[model samples]
Target: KIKSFEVVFNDPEKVYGSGERVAGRVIVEVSEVTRVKAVRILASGVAKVLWMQGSQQCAQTSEYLRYEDTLLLEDQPTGENEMVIMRPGNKYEYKFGFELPQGPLGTSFKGKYGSVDYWVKAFLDRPSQPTQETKKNFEVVDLV
Candidate 1:
C-alpha cells in the first residue's frame, strides 16, 4: 500500500552572489501502511557549450553527487492489528541541504518558456513494483 509524498526547500530559496550558497530540505510522510525502499534527490542539466555543440552526451545530470542516502520504513510488531511504523501516526520528515557551485551571471538552468534553475526532487522506490515521483518543482536564482 504505497501513498503520496512531498519535497521542500528551506529558507533563502534564491541563491545569489559571485559564489552563492543554496540550501534545501526534503520531507517524506507516509499516509498508509506501505513499504518504502529509497528516497533521493537529483540535479542535472547541460552547459551552454553542449547546447551549441548539440551533443546529447554532453547533456549531463547528477544525482546528489555530493550526498546520497537510502531510506527504509518498516513496521514493528505491536499487536494483532497494530504495528509500530516509522512514524506511529504515519508521518516522517527528512532534511537535506546543497551548497550551490560557484559560477558567473546568466549561468543557470535556462529552459524554453520559463527557466530551468537548480532544484531538488524526491523519488520513492516502493514495494508495489512501481515507483512514485513527487510532482513539485523548486527554483534557484543568482544575482548578477
Candidate 2:
C-alpha cells in the first residue's frame, strides 16, 4: 500500500529571484513494495500540450497538459529515493519544465506564454500488483 505525500519546491525558502528555476520533487513510500516495473511522472492533462504550437495562444491551460515518462529507479537496488528531484532548479525554474511535453525533459514553452505552474504526480507500476499513484503540489514564483 502507498502512504502520504508532500511537495517540495527547489526554492523552499519561497524566495525566487528573476530567471530562477522552479523545480519539484515527489516523495513516495510504499508500505510493502515488490518488483517495481516502471516509475513515471505525468502532468494532470497530457493531451492539450500535444498541440501547444497549434494556436498562437492555446486556450487550454495546463489543467489538461500531462507529461509522463519512465524512470529506471529499480536498477539502483534501492526502493527509497530520498526527496527525488525529478526537475532541477535552473535559470528559469517552473512548470516542472516545458521542453518535450512527453519525454524526459517536458516540452519547454516561452516564459512569455505564462507563468510556471505544475504539480509532481507519479505512477509506480509493480509486478503482479496494482500500480501506485501519488501527487504533490509545487510552484515557482516568477520574479520577472
Candidate 3:
C-alpha cells in the first residue's frame, strides 16, 4: 500500500511572477517493496473563457505552457521490470523545473464565467498494479 505520495513546490506560498522559474519535487512513500517503471511529470497552464451570448454559449481557451518530462529514465531495471526498485522506509524524490513566459499574461485564478489554473500532475507506472497519480496546484502571479 502507498502510505504517502504527492508533489510539492519549493516556494512557501507557491507564488510566481511573469518570466519566473517554477520548481517542485515529488515524494513517494510505500508500506512495502514497490516496483516502478516510469515516473512522468505533466505541467499545464490553461485559461478558459466561457460566457453566454443571449441564446448561445461561447467558450474559448488560452493555453500557456504544456510541458512533459520523464523524471526517472537514466536508471533502469532488470528483466522483471524495466523501471526501478522502490523499497519501504526509503523516501523517493523526483525534481522538475519549468519557466514561465516573459510577457503580458494572466494569473492563476477562477472567475465567474472563466477560469485560469495551473497544475502539476505525476503519474506512477507500476507495470502490473493499477496506476497511481499525485497532483498539485500552484499559484501564478501577474506583473503590475
Candidate 4:
C-alpha cells in the first residue's frame, strides 16, 4: 500500500540562521491506491546537555522553538483534517515553510554527549494502520 515516505528540504545542505526561512516538502510514494487520514508535522528546536559529574549523569533540555502546521498537498475535499483518496503510482508532495527566531538561538552540534538539534518531524495517519513518522534534521547557526 505504501512504497516510500520521506521528509525533504529544498536545499540539500539544510543550514539556516536566525531570522531565516526554512522551507521543505514531505514526499509520499505509493504502490497501489491508498487512503490517508491526514498528515501533520511538528517543527521544533531543542538543546540537550549531558555531562557526568562525580558519579552521576546530569542532563537538561531546553526548547527553543515550537510550531505545527497542516500541509495541503491536494485540492479541496482533501483537507488535512479529513480523509483523502490517494492514486496509485504517483509521488505526493506536501509543503511547509516558516521563519526562525532572531535571538537566543543555539548552533547545531553533537559530540560525545547531547547537543543542540533542529528537525521537522512528520506523522502520517491512516485508517487502521499505526501512525507513521519521518523527520529530517537541519543545522542552525546564529551570530553570537
Candidate 5:
C-alpha cells in the first residue's frame, strides 16, 4: 500500500471549459522502497447510466475523452526488470496534462441511477505486489 497519494490541479477553481487544457500533478509518498514495472497517469471524461431491472443491474458508459502517459521506466538485468523503483521516504511527482473536446462536453452531474464524470487516475504497476492507484475528480463547464 502507498503511504500517501494525492492529485493537485493547477487552477484553484478546478474548473475548465471545453477545448481547455487540464493541467495537474500526481504526488505519491512511499514508506518503504518498492519496485514496480512502471508509473503512469490516466485522464478520462465519461457519461454513463445505470439502473436495476428485475434484480439485474444494467449500465452503459460513453467515453468523451481519454489520455494516458507513462512517467518512468526502469532498467532490467534479466530483461524482465523494466521496473520503476521507488525509494523510501521519497516523494514522487508526475505531471498530467490533457485537453477537453471542443463544444458540448457532458458536464459533471449526478442522477438517481447514474452520472457523468471526469477523473484522473495514477497507477503503479508491480510484478510481486498488488497495483497501487489514486484518483481525483474535476469539473468541466460549457464555454460562454
Candidate 6:
C-alpha cells in the first residue's frame, strides 16, 4: 500500500518570476514492497486564454515549459522490461531544479475571461498498478 506522495518547493511563498529558478523535491513512501515501472517527475508552465470574439468563443493554450524525467530505472530484467521493484519501508526522494524562461514568459493571471497558471507534478509508474501522482501550483510574475 502507498503511504504518502508529496511535492515541496524551495520557495516558501511558492512565487516566482521569469528567469527565476523553480526548485523542488518529490517524495514518496510505501508501506510494503512494490513492483513497478519507472518513477517520473514533470514540471511545466502553461497559459490559456478563452474569450468571446465576434459572438464566437475562442480558446488557446500555450505551453512555455515541459520538463519530464525518470527518477529511478529498474535495473533487473523483468517480464515486461522497464519494471522496477521498490523496497518496503523506504522513503524515495527526488530533487528537481530548473529555471523558467527569461523573456516573454507569461505571468500567472486570472481574469474575468481567462487565466494563466504554472505547476509541478511528480508521479510513480507501475505496470498494471495504479499510478500515483502529486502536483503543486505556483505563481509567476512577468518581467517589466
Best-fitting candidate, scored by lDDT: 4
- Better candidate number, 1 or 2, judged by TM-score: 1
**How do the residues 1-144 of candidate 1 rate in per-residue lDDT, one tens digit apiece?**
244466665664454343445445455665555545566666332233233245443443432223344432333333343423444365565555555444533344343322334445567765546767663444444444
How far residue 54's Cα lies from its native spot in candidate 5, in Å, is 26
Which tens-of-lDDT digit does each residue in 1-144 have in candidate 2? 544333445566553333444356544444443344556677543212323555555533444345565544332443554322222221211123322232222234343343344556767665666877777544333232
TM-score of 4: 0.80
In model 5, residue pairs whose N, Cα or C atoms come closer than 3 Å (at least 3 residues apart or on different chains), thus clashing, are: none
What overall lDDT goes with each candidate model?
Answer: 0.47, 0.44, 0.76, 0.79, 0.74, 0.72
Model 5 ranges with Cα > 4 A deviation: 48-61, 73-81, 108-114
lDDT of 1 at 123: 72
TM-score, every prediction = 0.55, 0.43, 0.79, 0.80, 0.73, 0.73
Candidate 3 residue 31 Cα shift, in angstroms, is 0.9
Q: What is candidate 3's lDDT per residue for 11-32, written digit by digit as tens?
A: 7586777788889778777788
Mind giving the per-residue lDDT tens digits that candidate 5 earns over 1-144?
Answer: 778778888885777888999987777777887776766888888877776777887776778778889764223222555555678777777677889888656553343465668888888777778778888888878674
User: How much lDDT does candidate 2 score?
Assistant: 0.44
Ranking by lDDT: 4, 3, 5, 6, 1, 2
**In model 1, what is the error at residue 51, expressed in angstroms?**
11
The residue ranges of model 3 lying beyond 4 angstroms of the native Cα positions read 50-59, 73-81, 108-112
Off by over 4 Å in 4: 49-60, 79-81, 108-114
Strongest candidate by TM-score: 4
For TM-score, candidate 3 versus 4, the one ahead is: 4
Worst 10 residues of 4 by lDDT: 104-113
* Local accuracy of candidate 4 as per-residue lDDT tens digits, 37-63: 877889999987777777887777778
- Superposed on all Cα atoms, model 6 deviates from the true structure by an RMSD in Å of 4.1
Better of 1 and 5 by lDDT: 5
True lDDT of residue 52, candidate 6 = 69
